[PDB]
Design a protein around this ligand. Structure first.
Ligand SMILES: CCCCCCCCCC(=O)SCCNC(=O)CCNC(=O)[C@H](O)C(C)(C)COP(=O)(O)OP(=O)(O)OC[C@H]1O[C@@H](n2cnc3c(N)ncnc32)[C@H](O)[C@@H]1OP(=O)(O)O
Ligand SMILES: CCCCCCCCCC(=O)SCCNC(=O)CCNC(=O)[C@H](O)C(C)(C)COP(=O)(O)OP(=O)(O)OC[C@H]1O[C@@H](n2cnc3c(N)ncnc32)[C@H](O)[C@@H]1OP(=O)(O)O
Ligand SMILES: Cc1cc2nc3c(=O)[nH]c(=O)nc-3n(C[C@H](O)[C@H](O)[C@H](O)COP(=O)(O)OP(=O)(O)OC[C@H]3O[C@@H](n4cnc5c(N)ncnc54)[C@H](O)[C@@H]3O)c2cc1C
Ligand SMILES: Cc1cc2nc3c(=O)[nH]c(=O)nc-3n(C[C@H](O)[C@H](O)[C@H](O)COP(=O)(O)OP(=O)(O)OC[C@H]3O[C@@H](n4cnc5c(N)ncnc54)[C@H](O)[C@@H]3O)c2cc1C
Lengths: 607, 607
């Protein structure tokens, strides 16, 4: 029962802050009303806290075992039981297209539902991403492939995304797996891929769809030469879906990892065992990296939401421990060594720790839900007044924040959650040490933090001509310019916004200088991650302050009891974050304004 | 080779070229230990560490100790016991031991440099080997008769434990309820249950274990001042010959399952609860337990900080070796050319940023603990600093919570950069960095949590000290600032010194104003950890700048080859640290100047 959920904060964001209930019961969501959405959140949170979280510890302590002669993994029984509870409730089809058996819903609600599985047992959601992948295959496929995608979604096949090779991780375009065209128009895929999540999954599914990047013989270099292929674990009857003979794609190793142990992470060999790995060209066009980024975009959203979900349950575990742990006297009585003992929430450093965890957990929740409000044209129109084109560019801008800032922040603040338990935090008896191990990977897969920061600056700001960035900046500025009980917070946000504008100007300056001195581009690289984290902090502080403004209205109107306590904590979090996290951005701007290439010119031997 | 990458070159640079410890080698207490022999010892223990000690690092984690309830003992993996024997066979469990107990006299600065290698290679091995050093502390606090037993204990290499913590008494040692009942013969029966005792059993490593136990004599007053310290051996023994006799009533009942440091058996320890009394002898036959035990705690806190620093160092050097060989991506100056040559990742700005961050903190932290150690011998402090015994003791006590608190927190945080440098492979148990992270998380918790370190630093080592040690250190920093190639660094150090001065003044004001407004003291608690970390950053930057000043002199004198590369790295690290780490202290000062009690007044239910 490690998993502590926060449906109340989810509903607060979705309805009281962002107004996603504006679209419920109209247009694409005509059959889903606000009551039902709330019931779904409560239901999956209960299921997550129970049967899904039930095997969280077991998956880590009794991890999958690989049989190299069968090329299969065995998963622990309790975890597979958790997977069946997910399937029996339909929770592998959250947000699936209606024509694939899904329940239409705004993406903001879909990711809030998914947060609970990611908090309780995140590898369970990863194993369950098959139907979502089938929908992406459907969207990119020919008419005939759409029929296969429909079967795969209805039968609940598992799925993988297969990019990485030993020499091609961040540099996808270096991959050497090849595709050999056959006279009948299929392809034979030949190569060894590495680190493939869920490439075998015991007997969870009757089939697995591998979506594989490979280079057709004679194609050009880099990512632009790659094509994407549908490579099923088993051949099947294209009309009925009846499972046929084994296709030539075999797991040949399973990694031993720091955490996320129950997610089998696999070396995957294609066409290496005397049986061809037949692949079908997705959409029967050569457009592999663009097609695969439909998948990567979802994976990056998931990984960021995963890290955020994990910090939230980490914080709530730390809080519940702190409420009960008696240790020491109140600081106002520290010299009286017979003073009454107090619970540790009375100690200033513990309250600082807990409010740091709270503000970042809740600010991050607001960030991913805000990001999701731009993932549906109809939601972005109704709740922001933004047309479909700008909505897509804003969503693309925020994804590296969700992924990069989410992963880095959650892992770092889980350090505070563990510390709150004292020595017991180091014990496996409590879940926080597993939270830390399970979440360290989030800064690495789906593109490292450095790759996120490079995407954010070069593709999502510069190539975008800053239009999404300017949009978000204008919303922040509008909040600042708009009661005076938030006057101090709006002043701190104004400074933080000017700091981030300054960082953006400096980095853009170094880029322009690279027209004359190519090495000036290195300064962009040196500051890129700090810039990404700075924008994340600014967004956290702004969204928390928006939450405080709503909380003030609800308190003024007469909130009582648990509602009152909730709203009071929003005011406290927004004020704490503005006063203790935002000012650091000023020093970070000054640091970025003074970057130089000394560290780039230093001989490698001097390190 | 092994996981453990050592840096004797940087240790010798600190000891000789920076701090001048070789000036006392060959004179007075160290008359028969010259500089050549000191260097030989460091090189020899580094090889022992890289060889047989590191050999069981992985095995201790993957095949951890097992509790046997049939015998109330713990069994250790055979490979780790072989590492322990390599330690004993070379006499390294006697490092810095008093000559009359069989030790080789040496400066504490050299002793801790030797110990760093064991802590980097397999830190639990040093912990199990702390027996003879504990016997020396028993000797110094013991009666004339007890001094005879401590001598036997050191000569026989008995293990030892420090036994304070109980389920309800961790940070608040004074709440302990373990009891001592005096017997007619002048011995005591100890009755109670202790928790989290390191090395509480150790298989067949030793013929006896000395437990140093805190307990409250019947009728004594409350808190730590009512505690007494007892010598409680695992076996009774002949006080003249040392021959092992009957089992004493002190038994392990459990072994904790921990995130890391797994091969260090951490045990619940039951005294007098299994049918026979736990006989204890009052140490020094005086009631003075917490003062006596703090002789041990001081050593443990130095060890823990040095452990964290040793672990970051080998983490860094592993990441650096990996980065030098990993090919991935094109040079940033060619990023739009998709056929540009592939480069090793040390060519990427974010990777060089990461590596230089790891390097500067690892080397800055090594300078800090070695600088601290130069104040632990009156003769060294006199010779290398010109400070008398009293001031030297106060400066050492000032710096200990920096070594422990700033060392532990910084090492764990920067190991995140080390792991990130490996990409997805950093998440694999195939590489040692994930174990470095798990093994080092505990360094912020045991031997006093970070909050307790920061409270000790401010309340006891500054305020109670009337700032004398703090003013001495600040004056040394100011003298360096006062004094061309280091002008920018000295300017940044001047800002950082003023920032820490401002922090100290704000927190002192919050404390003194508590006389008229009791809740003012909470702002001290809110700011104390950030202040401890700021002092650590300031010291890191100053010591790095001192190292660069030495490196400039040696480069000007004509250094070549590997020496020149080393010195160039010192100049680069001092400059990077001054420009990228120190400025953040300005924002932290302003944050501390604006702390308020809103987070203290908030209802606990609002969290
Ligand atoms: C179903 C089971 C899932 C279980 C959960 C598993 C979770 C973790 C799984 C993984 O880790 S999957 C492997 C993840 N690998 C990555 O994320 C790659 C990281 N490297 C990069 O992102 C590089 O920055 C890369 C894009 C590879 C650089 O290659 P490039 O060739 O230099 O890229 P370029 O900038 O020129 O763009 C080429 C085309 O790629 C598309 N594209 C790039 N970036 C994006 C983004 N951010 N969004 C959408 N598409 C993108 C474009 O088509 C682009 O072409 P264009 O510039 O428009 O002409
Ligand atoms: C042998 C093989 C094992 C080694 C490997 C194991 C590694 C780690 C093992 C452990 O974790 S052992 C358990 C560690 N426990 C602690 O470190 C306690 C953490 N809590 C504190 O430090 C509290 O701050 C404490 C001091 C307990 C508060 O109690 P207090 O009663 O309120 O303390 P007070 O400030 O009034 O002083 C009382 C007496 O204690 C001595 N003393 C306190 N601080 C120090 C320091 N920093 N140095 C030296 N002595 C200290 C004084 O005797 C003081 O009395 P006085 O004020 O001088 O009259
Ligand atoms: C691996 C391991 C080995 C150990 N080995 C030994 C050993 O050999 N011998 C031994 O005696 N002990 C040992 N311990 C005990 C260890 O020193 C304690 O865990 C530590 O002192 C913290 O105490 P606690 O666990 O009770 O946490 P708590 O004291 O309950 O701390 C809980 C939280 O409250 C905070 N807090 C507590 N009091 C205050 C205060 N007054 N002001 C502000 N914040 C406060 C703490 O910082 C922490 O965040 C070991 C522990 C571990 C994990
Ligand atoms: C648990 C796990 C599961 C995975 N699952 C999958 C999966 O299902 N499918 C899949 O396709 N892949 C998967 N991967 C692969 C994963 O996405 C890669 O590990 C990741 O992209 C990093 O690549 P790499 O490990 O080769 O590291 P590298 O690319 O070698 O990176 C090493 C270091 O260099 C830095 N670096 C590299 N290039 C640059 C650059 N141009 N600029 C700046 N810095 C740079 C990186 O930031 C990093 O710090 C998985 C990995 C893990 C660990």
């Amino acid at each position: 029962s490690h998993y502590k959920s926060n449906v109340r904060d989810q509903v607060f964001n979705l309805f009281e802050v962002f107004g996603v209930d504006k679209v419920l019961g109209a247009d694409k969501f005509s059959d889903l009303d606000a009551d039902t959405a709330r019931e779904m959140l409560t239901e999956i949170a209960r299921l997550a806290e129970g049967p899904i979280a039930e095997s969280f510890v077991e998956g880590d302590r009794n991890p999958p075992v690989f049989d190299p002669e069968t090329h299969t993994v065995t998963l622990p029984e309790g975890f597979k039981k958790s997977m069946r509870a997910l399937f029996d409730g339909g929770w592998d089809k959250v947000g699936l297209a209606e024509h694939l058996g899904g329940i239409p819903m705004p993406r903001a609600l879909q990711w809030a539902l998914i947060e609970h599985i990611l908090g309780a047992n995140p590898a369970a959601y990863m194993y369950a991403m098959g139907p979502g992948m089938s929908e992406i295959f459907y969207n990119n496929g020919t008419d005939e492939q759409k029929k296969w995608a429909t079967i795969a979604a209805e039968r609940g096949w598992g799925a993988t995304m297969v990019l990485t090779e030993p020499d091609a991780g961040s540099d996808v375009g270096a991959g050497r797996t090849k595709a050999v065209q056959q006279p009948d128009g299929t392809w034979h895929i030949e190569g060894v891929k590495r680190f493939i999540t869920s490439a075998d999954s015991d007997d969870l599914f009757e089939n697995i769809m591998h979506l594989v990047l490979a280079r057709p013989e004679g194609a050009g270099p880099g990512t632009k030469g790659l094509s994407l292929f549908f490579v099923p674990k088993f051949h099947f009857d294209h009309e009925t879906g009846e499972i046929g003979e084994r296709n030539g794609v075999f797991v040949t190793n399973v990694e031993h990892k720091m955490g996320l142990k129950v997610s089998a992470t696999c070396e995957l060999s294609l066409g290496q065992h005397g049986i061809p790995a037949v692949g079908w060209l997705v959409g029967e066009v050569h457009n592999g990296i663009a097609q695969m980024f439909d998948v990567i975009e979802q994976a990056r959203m998931m990984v960021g939401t995963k890290a955020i979900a994990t910090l939230s349950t980490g914080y709530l575990n730390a809080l519940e421990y702190a409420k009960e742990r008696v240790q020491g006297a109140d600081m106002t009585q520290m010299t009286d060594k017979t003073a009454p003992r107090v619970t540790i929430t009375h100690h200033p450093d513990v309250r600082r720790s807990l409010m740091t965890q709270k503000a970042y957990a809740e600010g991050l929740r607001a960030i991913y839900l805000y990001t999701a409000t731009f993932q549906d044209a109809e939601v972005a129109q109704a709740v922001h007044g933004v047309d479909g084109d700008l909505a897509a560019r804003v969503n693309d801008l925020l994804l590296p924040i969700v992924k990069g800032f989410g992963s880095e922040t959650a892992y770092a603040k889980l350090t505070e959650s563990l510390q709150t338990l004292g020595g017991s935090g180091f014990l496996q008896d409590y879940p926080i040490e597993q939270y830390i191990r399970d979440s360290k990977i989030d800064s690495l897969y789906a593109g490292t933090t450095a790759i996120q920061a490079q995407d954010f600056f070069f593709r999502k700001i510069i190539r975008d001509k800053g239009q999404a960035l300017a949009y978000v900046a204008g919303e922040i500025e509008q909040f600042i310019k708009n009661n005076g009980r938030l006057k101090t917070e709006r002043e701190l946000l104004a400074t933080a916004l000017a700091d981030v504008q300054g960082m953006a100007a400096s980095l853009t300056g170094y880029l322009m200088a690279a027209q004359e001195d190519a090495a000036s581009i290195y300064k962009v690289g040196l500051g890129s991650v700090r810039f990404l984290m700075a924008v994340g902090d600014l967004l956290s502080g702004w969204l928390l302050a928006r939450q405080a403004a709503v909380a003030i209205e609800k308190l003024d109107a007469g909130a009582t009891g648990a509602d009152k306590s909730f709203y009071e904590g929003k005011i406290a979090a927004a004020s704490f974050f503005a006063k203790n996290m935002l000012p650091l951005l000023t020093s970070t701007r000054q640091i970025i304004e003074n970057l130089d290439n000394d560290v780039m010119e230093l001989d490698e031997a001097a390190f």
